Design a protein around this ligand. Structure first.
Ligand SMILES: Nc1ncnc2c1ncn2[C@@H]1O[C@H](COP(=O)(O)OP(=O)(O)OP(=O)(O)O)[C@@H](O)[C@H]1O
Ligand SMILES: [Mg+2]
Lengths: 463, 71, 71
DNA sequence: TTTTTT
């Protein structure tokens, strides 16, 4: 009977080392699952577990070479693989897992059954995870200053506290969020607060993932977001200036799918799991290459209307339309945030918000009204109705309005379309839209015959 | 051997190859195809598909099926 | 080999290839009209110890704009 | 072209 083989078998019987679908080895050390492709975590586990073995086995693990032998045996006995990260409503920490449904905190073997390969990076503390505390009273003041509790701002505030609470879930989100506002409105303060709240589950990337192709060669900017729960892109440029590239309309469609194709350097893995809420903070509204219905159901906007200014520049701020109120700036808040003063209170507030919106089911919805570029496409659907068979008997009235029958279909030639459409949209501001629209839906019956398959709703009602 | 029919329509055989007047191809294209929507296709076809035997005659080595019908 | 359509010219390709096997290789018109010393060329690596190479389906080079062969 | 990769 080989002694090291017996040690390897006893270690394997504790289910402390597992093999994943991606080829990685995950090790249960210090109430958390850890993995790394450059460090020997298995030897660390072997050294750590020696206290649970009987005394004639513990002394044999002090020699590194015997640890390598046991590692080789353990590698030889692992033949089947398992799935990881399947529970969306569990928040993993450095020393346990927090349940978001009831609020209980699990540690030890109770937390081992949830195979989580990510963590916040810091230890949970129930002492500071309370509602009655001076830091909570302080934090509520900043939160109310950024988002006032007024009737005009109610809907926007609810959307603001839904998007933030969406960052605690490990599922796929079907919308992207834009934080739009003028300078000095608190957009970055919430980013710092969320980073301090969630730790390692937060990530910030560049702007290439909205502009460049994601699948040409290595791209760490897209492969570093695997299994993350919050992604921030910051400060996209103004597109009015010449030379600025526009946002790929098809790129944001790939950022919604549960799987994203990307490759790190010196790697063959091309699949990344999408668990992240994507937030872009901006000073200018975005511009897209192409506008379509698939694009309009994936965009949301949150506004910021409070300005924090020094006393010298207060007088100008009150004369700006882009602000609704002006408040004195605090010069010591950034240092307090950097010191993780408001970490656990913001975590408690995020959990409280999570229980309000996402317990039945988690879903995000778009707000296409905020974007002014969409205003044309939204309006056309309310002014033009597609031709149908049921409209044939009514054409007796439509004859006086200039409609012509072609191929037994109600049609309206191009020449008479322009003055009809000019009664709603001005030529100067919407010239490119109606030009593109007419070229993309023009149909010709002959070399000199033109017709369109739409009728106005105002034309089916007798004047 | 079918030139006996083509000569009935005024078509010609030059440089030992059957050819038609150019104006005839554009009138047939206009009469069967819409110029506005397929002008680029017709222009590319003509430019990349033209053949010449000398510095004066340009020709295409193809015959319409409708030309085979008896006049 | 010069000939007209439906003239067993493609059949002899099969008779020869069945007779030779993997050594026989096909090629297109991409390489004969383009410079092989410029850019990557997998065919330049591929003909290594090939026994015979066959080129067919050549478009007519008499058309204007069609890039003739490079001698 | 060059990081890429070897
Ligand atoms: N509730 C508050 N009371 C007082 N000062 C505050 C409050 N919230 C934020 N501030 C201060 O406002 C200043 C400007 O805020 P911040 O930098 O977050 O604005 P912003 O709109 O995100 O700016 P930008 O996008 O230009 O970076 C910061 O120095 C911050 O300390
Ligand atoms: Mg900011």
């Amino acid at each position: 009977g080989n002694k090291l083989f017996n040690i390897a078998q006893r270690i394997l019987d504790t289910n402390s080392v597992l093999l994943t679908e991606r080829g990685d080895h995950i090790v249960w050390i210090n109430n958390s699952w850890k993995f790394n492709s450059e460090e020997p975590l298995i030897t660390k586990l072997i050294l750590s577990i020696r206290h649970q073995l009987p005394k004639e086995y513990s002394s044999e693990l002090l020699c590194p070479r015997k640890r390598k032998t046991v590692e080789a045996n353990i590698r030889d006995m692992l033949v089947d693989s398992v799935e990881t990260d399947t529970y969306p409503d569990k928040l993993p920490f450095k020393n346990g897992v927090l349940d978001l449904v009831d609020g209980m905190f699990y540690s030890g073997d109770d937390a081992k059954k949830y195979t989580c390969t990510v963590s916040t990076g810091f230890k949970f503390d129930d002492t500071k995870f309370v509602e009655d505390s001076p830091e909570m009273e302080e934090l509520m003041n900043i939160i109310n200053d950024i988002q006032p509790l007024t009737d005009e701002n109610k809907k926007n505030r609810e959307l603001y506290e839904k998007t933030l609470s969406s960052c605690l879930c490990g599922a796929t989100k079907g919308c992207l969020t834009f934080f739009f506002g003028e300078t000095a409105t608190g957009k970055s303060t919430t980013k710092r607060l969320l980073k301090s709240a969630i730790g390692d589950l937060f990530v910030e990337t560049g702007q290439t993932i909205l502009t460049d192709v994601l699948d040409k060669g290595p791209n760490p900017f897209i492969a570093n977001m695997h299994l993350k729960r919050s992604v921030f892109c910051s400060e996209l440029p103004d597109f009015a200036c010449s030379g600025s590239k526009k946002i790929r309309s098809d790129n944001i469609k790939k950022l919604t799918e549960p799987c994203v194709i990307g490759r790190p350097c010196f790697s063959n893995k091309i699949n990344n799991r999408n668990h992240a809420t994507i937030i872009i903070d901006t000073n200018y509204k975005p511009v897209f290459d192409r506008i379509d219905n698939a694009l309009m159901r994936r965009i949301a906007v949150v506004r910021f209307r409070t300005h924090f200014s020094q006393p010298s520049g207060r007088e100008a701020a009150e004369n700006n339309d882009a602000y609704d109120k002006v408040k004195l700036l605090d010069e010591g808040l950034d240092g307090k945030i950097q010191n993780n003063r408001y970490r656990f209170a913001f975590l408690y507030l995020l959990v409280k918000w999570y229980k309000k919106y996402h317990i039945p089911i988690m879903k995000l919805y778009p707000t296409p009204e905020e974007i002014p570029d969409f205003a044309f496409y939204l309006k056309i659907g309310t002014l033009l109705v597609s031709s149908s068979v049921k409209h044939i008997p009514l054409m007796t009235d439509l004859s006086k309005k200039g409609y012509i029958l072609y191929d037994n279909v109600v049609t309206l030639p191009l020449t008479t379309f322009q003055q009809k459409i000019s009664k709603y949209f001005n030529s100067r501001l919407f010239g490119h839209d109606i030009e593109s629209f007419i070229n993309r839906h023009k149909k010709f019956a002959n070399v000199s015959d033109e017709y369109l398959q739409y009728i106005f709703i105002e034309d089916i009602s007798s004047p």
